[PDB]
Every structure is written in structure tokens, then in C-alpha cells.
């Protein structure tokens with residue numbers, strides 16, 4: 001069972017601007033998704049302060065970066081709080097409509113795309129390098145779900161029959177053909193060290209065969 005939704009017009013306008021505007025500093029996508037993972041990890045840790053059983057789905061709080069050259073995918077895995085089905089449909093738990101409004105007004109007022117994170121819509125920078133994004137997520141209060149979109153004005157949500165996640169979120173970036181540099185080991189370390197050096201969680205860059 002697959003449900004297909006239309007993006008709100010403002011969100012579809014945001015993704016098309018990200019996809020079509022000439023902008024070379026594409027590496028900021030990783031900082032934004034890592035920052036999102038850190039926020040999700042902060043929340044589940046806070047809830048565990050008064051209810052330790054919230055970590056029964058996994059006590060480890062970490063971020064993994066998994067490149068796969070054969071699939072041409074870069075996967076950002078975290079064990080944060082995760083998202084419910086309603087959160088996924090609700091623009092992945094953000095106020096993306098009002099956040100996009102402020103972002104596009106800043107852009108005409110001198111801003112550039114790299115400041116997208118200060119507006120709560122940093123997730124959509126993933127489409128600087130990915131032609132398709134798959135979000136697998138598991139919240140303690142819901143089942144495991146899969147969110148997917150190749151832009152084009154629509155996204156799908158389905159029950160995920162894949163590997164059970166325990167708790168957290170998996171962001172799978174199906175990279176564009178000319179953006180495979182973000183699967184190289186030394187390129188990812190350089191980006192993590194320059195934009196994410198103060199994330200308060202272990203970031204493990206998986207290596208390949």
C-alpha cells in the first residue's frame with residue numbers, strides 16, 4: 001500500500017529553486033542533515049532523562065555515514081527520536097511552509113542557499129546532490145515508515161518492510177551522476193571536519209570494500 005501526496009505549492013517551489021539555481025557550494029547538504037540528526041538525538045536524550053524506558057529501542061546515540069558506490073547512495077543514519085507517520089506527511093516534522101516563506105525573502109534580500117538551515121528547511125538541501133531521497137524512520141510511538149520523493153511535486157509514504165530500525169531515521173541520498181564525489185572517503189571527512197566539527201555525537205564514516 002503506497003500513498004501519494006502532493007507537496008504544498010510553497011515547498012514544491014523551494015525544491016525546484018534548489019534543483020535549478022546555479023549554486024556551486026553544494027557540500028552544505030551534509031551539514032544540514034547531520035544537524036537535523038543531532039537535533040533528533042537531543043530530543044530522545046531529553047525524554048530519556050525522566051523516562052529511561054524511552055531508550056528500550058536502543059541506548060546508543062550516534063550518527064553513521066554509509067557511502068555505497070555500487071548503489072550510488074549516501075546514507076545518513078541516526079538513532080534519534082525518529083518521526084511518526086503524521087510527522088512525515090507534515091513536511092517531515094517541520095513548519096516548512098512558513099520556513100520557506102522566510103527563506104525566499106532572505107534570498108532576494110542578499111542571502112545565499114547556505115543559510116537555509118537558519119529557517120528550518122535545511123532537509124531540502126539534500127536535492128542539491130540527490131535526484132531522489134528516501135527517508136526511513138521509526139518513532140517509539142509509531143511503526144516504521146518510508147518517505148520518498150524525486151521532487152516533481154509529489155512524495156510517497158508507505159509502511160517499510162525493510163530491516164527493522166529500532167529507533168531513529170535513515171536518510172538515503174540517491175546521488176546525481178555528477179555528484180559522486182560525496183561518496184569518496186576523503187571528501188566526506190573534509191566536509192565533516194569543516195562544517196560539523198562540534199556535533200556532540202559520534203559520527204562514524206563507514207568504509208567500503
Ligand SMILES: Brc1n[nH]c2cnccc12
Nearest residue numbers: 036039040082092093094
Ligand atoms: Br525529530 C525531527 N523531525 N523533523 C526535524 C527537522 N529537523 C531536525 C529534527 C527533526
Ligand SMILES: Brc1n[nH]c2cnccc12
Nearest residue numbers: 036037040080092123169
Ligand atoms: Br527532516 C530530517 N532530516 N534528518 C532527520 C533525522 N531525524 C529526524 C528528522 C530528520
Ligand SMILES: Brc1n[nH]c2cnccc12
Nearest residue numbers: 039040041043093094120
Ligand atoms: Br528535535 C525536532 N523535532 N522536530 C523538529 C523540527 N525542527 C527542528 C528540530 C526538531
Ligand SMILES: Brc1n[nH]c2cnccc12
Nearest residue numbers: 039043092093094095120
Ligand atoms: Br518538537 C518540534 N516541532 N517543531 C520544532 C521546531 N523547533 C524545535 C523543536 C520542534
